[PDB]
Amino acid sequence: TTDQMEMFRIPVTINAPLQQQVFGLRLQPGLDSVFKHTLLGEILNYYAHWSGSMKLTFVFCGSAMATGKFLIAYSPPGANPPKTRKDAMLGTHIIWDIGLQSSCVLCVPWISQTHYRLVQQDEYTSAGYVTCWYQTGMIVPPGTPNSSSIMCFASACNDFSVRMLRDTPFISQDNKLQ
Amino acid sequence: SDRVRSITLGNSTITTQECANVVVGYGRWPTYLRDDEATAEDQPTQPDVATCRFYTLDSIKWEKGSVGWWWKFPEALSDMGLFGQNMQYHYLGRAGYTIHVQCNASKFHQGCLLVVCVPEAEMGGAVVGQAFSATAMANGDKAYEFTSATQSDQTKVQTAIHNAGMGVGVGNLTIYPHQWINLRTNNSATIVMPYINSVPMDNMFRHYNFTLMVIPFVKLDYADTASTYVPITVTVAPMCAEYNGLRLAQAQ
Amino acid sequence: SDRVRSITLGNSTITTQECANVVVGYGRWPTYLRDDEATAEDQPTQPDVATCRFYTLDSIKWEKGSVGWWWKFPEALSDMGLFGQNMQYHYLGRAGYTIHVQCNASKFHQGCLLVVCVPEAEMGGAVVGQAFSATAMANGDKAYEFTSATQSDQTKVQTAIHNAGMGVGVGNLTIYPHQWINLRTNNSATIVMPYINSVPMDNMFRHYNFTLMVIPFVKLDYADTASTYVPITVTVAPMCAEYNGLRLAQAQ
Amino acid sequence: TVENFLGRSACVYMEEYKTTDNDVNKKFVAWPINTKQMVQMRRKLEMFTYLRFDMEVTFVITSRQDPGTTLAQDMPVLTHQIMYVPPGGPIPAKVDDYAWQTSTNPSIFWTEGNAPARMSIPFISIGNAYSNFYDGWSNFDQRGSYGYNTLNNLGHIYVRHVSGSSPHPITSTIRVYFKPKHTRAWVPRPPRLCQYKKAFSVDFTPTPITDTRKDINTVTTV
Amino acid sequence: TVENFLGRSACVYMEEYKTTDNDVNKKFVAWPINTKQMVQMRRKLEMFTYLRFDMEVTFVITSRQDPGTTLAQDMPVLTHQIMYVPPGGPIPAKVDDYAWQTSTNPSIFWTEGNAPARMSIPFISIGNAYSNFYDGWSNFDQRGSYGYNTLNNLGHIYVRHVSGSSPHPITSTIRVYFKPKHTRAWVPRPPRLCQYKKAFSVDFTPTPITDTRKDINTVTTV
C-alpha cells in the first residue's frame, strides 16, 4: 500500500479468469486487521466476549454501464478455508447482481458451539471465513473504464451483544501528557 | 417490475434485474415419483437441500465469431457435490432442474441467443457409419461447441450448427422448452425442466435425459468499447432428486 | 417376551432374541438443537436416513486372556459413508447414537462384560509429563486395548485396566450409562446416548465427545468345545445428526 | 448439597510483593486466574465435569517488615490496589505504569487494618458451563494445546502497593479465596486418586488402588 | 448503556505534597479541575461531543516516610483537608494561610486509616451540557484562546495536611477519581486514534489508519 485510501477499494476488472476470487477475509471482528479498527471492532475492543450476526454490505462503485454477478459466501470453521468458488458455494452465500440497487448485504449468521466467542479470538473460538468470487464477470460497453472498485461496510445485527468490560490494547502512554 | 426475480433452493439464491418470464417444462412442474407410477420397491433417498441447490458450471466466452454450445445432463453435473456423489452410489436416479443462463452486455451491444433443452438429443457421427465415444459429446461440465463447417473428424459428432447435430432444421428447435436472450432486453434465461422419460427412473450415467443448447442466432456485435468478449455462465439446480438401488460407487 | 427386540433406522434393522432392556442416556432421548439453544446462525443440514442409520465396525476376538477395549466417538465413525462425509465438510456437528454391542456364546460358556459410554474420557500418558499423539487413542474404527500391566511405552496412553486410563477405580464406571453382557443371560447390549457437551455443537474431529469401553469383569471361560474365541461386534447409528458451517472438506 | 459442599471459601492462590526492591517484578503480582494450583479446591471442583456458578472472591493481605541491620522507621498505613484485567487488556509492566488508571477494568483499593476486601463476580464463561476437563485440542488439526488449559482464558489479577515505597523493605503476601455460590453441577466423576503433579495438566504417577493388609480375612488391628 | 460505560471511577489526577519541606509549594496541592490529563477517562468522555451528568468524586490518599539517614520518630495519625475553590475565590498561598478557614467553600477533613473520602457534585455547568470540544475562540474577534480550554472554568481543588509538620518528612500522594452518574450524551464522535500530546489541546502527530499485512489475501498468522 502506497496510498492509505486504497485500503478501502476492492479491485474488480474486465476479462477476469472465470471463477476468480475477488477477496478473502477471516471472521475475527475484534482481532483481524481488516475489522479491528472499524466502529464495530473498536467497540468490541473494550470487551472480552461477543455474540451475534453481522452485516457486510458491498457497494459497487463503477459506472452505471458496467454489469456483473458475484458470489459472496461465509464458511463456518473447519480445518481448511475454501480455495475455489466450488468450495465456497457449499456454505452460506448470496449471488449479487448489479443493477439500480448498487449495494448488497451478506448477513453472516451466528453459527457457533458456544453462546459467545472471545474478542481475543483463538482456534477454539474460531468463526470462519468470508470470500468473494466472480459469478459471471464484469462486462463493459465501449467507452467506460476497465476496472472499478467495490466497498465493504460492516455493522452488528439486532441479536448482537458484548460482555466482560476490559481496557483496549489500542491506546497507551509512557508519560503523563504535559 | 416483473423483470426482477429471486429464486432460492437450499443454501443458494439467484437474482436478476432484467429478465423475461420463467419457462416451465411442458407446463409441468418437477415432482417426486408417486406410488402408482413406481416399479423399484426400495425406500428412496431424497437428500433435499444437499442436492437440490444451485451449481455454477465453468463459464465460457461469447465472441463475435462464436457459433454455439451444448451440455448434456445429468453428465454435466456428475462432479457437483452431493448430487454427483448420489449419482455414483445409486443404480437409479430421477430429477427435474431449474436452468439459469446468465449473460450481461450493455445498451450498446447487440446479439441474440436461443436457450433450449432438447429431450433425448441423440446425435449423428461426423462420418456416417463411424461410431464415436461418449467423450465426443459429454465430459463433466465441459462445454462442447458446434461449428459452421461440416465436421470431418470421425472421432467427433457432426457439429455443423444448422442441423444441430440431429439432422433437423436448427430454426425449428423452438418446439422444445426455450427462452431467448436478446441483449437488447434480457440478461438471463430461466427454464424449469421436469423429469421426462419413457420409464419412471433411469440410470444417470448411461442416459443423457436432455441436452442444453445455447446458440447465437444473431451474432455478438459492438463498437469501440474496451470490453471484448461477453461471458456466458450456466447455473443449474436439481429439483426433487430421488435415488434407488444403493450399492458401491461407480469408479467414474 | 421383552427379550425380543427390533430397531429400525434408515435402511437398516437390528434384531435380538436374548436382550436385557435398552439403556437411554441420562433418561434423555436424542433430539435436534432448538432455536433457543442455538448460536450458529446458518441453516443446518439434517441428512436424515443417509446418516442416521446403522454402521458396523470391524469385529474383535474375546479370548480367555482378553483385558478390555475402547473406541472414541465420533472418530470411530469418521469413515462411515455419508456420516463421515458430512463430518469432513462441516465445521460443526451434533448427534446422539444408538450403540448395539453384540456377543453370543452358548449355555456352556461363562463371562461378563461391562459396556459403558464415558463422556469426556480424558486420558493420562503412559509416562507422566510425556505428551502422546491422537494416534495413541483413536484412529478410525480401530479397537484400542487396555493391558493388565502398567504401560511403559511413552508413545502410549496409560493402559492399565484397573484405572481405566483415567486415574479412577474401574469398578465405579457404573455411574456412566452402561449395560452388562453376562453370557449366561444376554447376547447383546443397547445404549442410546444423547448429545452431551458444554456447548450446543462442536467440531467432530477435534473433540471426542464420549468413549465406548467394553471390559471383561469376569473372564471368558469354557470347556471342551471346538469354538475358541467369541467375537464381539459393535454396530452404531447416529441419531438427529445436524451440521453447520459448510466449507471445503478436511483432508483427513 | 452441592451448594453446601462447594460453598466455603478456599485459598486458590498466594504470592508476595515487596514495597521496595531493585527488581521491578518483585514489587507487584501478576496472576493468570485459574483453580488448578491449590490442591484442595481443585479436587472438589474436579468431582464434577461441568459447573455453573457465581463467585464470591475474598482477599487476605498481610504485611511484615523484612529483617535487616537497621529497622527503625515509622511507615504510615499501607493501601493496596487489586486490578482485574480481562483477556486482551493492557498489562502493567511496573508498579508505576499508566495501566493502573483502571478507567474501565475493575479495581479494589483497600487499606490495612480493615475487614478483608470482597466482591462477587457472575458466571462469566463464554460457554454454558465451566469445564473442569477438556479431552481435546486447540487446533482443528488435532494439534496445539491439549486439555482443559486450552479453555482457560479468564484473564489476570494484578496487585501493587499504592504509593508505598518505604525506606526499608516491607513484604506483603496476598491470599485469594474463592467461594462458589448459586451452583449447578453436571456429570460427576471419580475423585482424583493420584497426587497432582502439574497445574495445567491431568498428569500423574501410577498409584495403587488402596493400601494392603496381610490376608483376605485379617480384621484385627494388631 | 452510556450510564454503564461511563459509570466506573477513573483516576483523573494525582500529585504529591510533603509534610515538611523548605519549599512552600511542595507542601500543598493546587489543581485546576479538568478531565484532560489522564488518557483513559479522556478518551471515553471524548467519544461524545456533549455530556450532562452528576459527578461522584472519591479520593485515595496514601503517605510514606521519606528515606534518610535518621528515620526514628513516632508521628500520630495524619489528617488532610481538601478544599474546593469555585472560580474567583481566595486561593491559598501556603499551608497555614487564612483561606483554609472555608467559611463558605466546601472542604473535607479526612483521617488516614479510614474508608476513602467521597461526595457527589451536581451538574454544575453554566451551559446546558458540558462540552468536550469547542471549535471556536474566546474573543469575538476570532482571536484569544482556541479550543475547549476556553470553556474550562470549574475552579480548583486545594489540599494540605492539617497540622502535620513532622520531624522527618513524610510524602502524601492524592489520587482523585471521577464517576459520572445520571448521564446523558449527545452527538457521538470517532474515538481518538492518535496518542494525546497536550492536556489542553487536540494536538497530535499523524498516525496511520491501522497496521499492515503482506497482501490483500493474507489470512494466516505465520
Swiss-Prot record, chains B, C:
<comment type="subunit">
    <text>Interacts with capsid protein VP1 and capsid protein VP3 in the mature capsid.</text>
</comment>
<protein>
    <recommendedName>
        <fullName>Capsid protein VP2</fullName>
    </recommendedName>
</protein>
<comment type="function">
    <text>Forms an icosahedral capsid of pseudo T=3 symmetry with capsid proteins VP2 and VP3. The capsid is 300 Angstroms in diameter, composed of 60 copies of each capsid protein and enclosing the viral positive strand RNA genome.</text>
</comment>
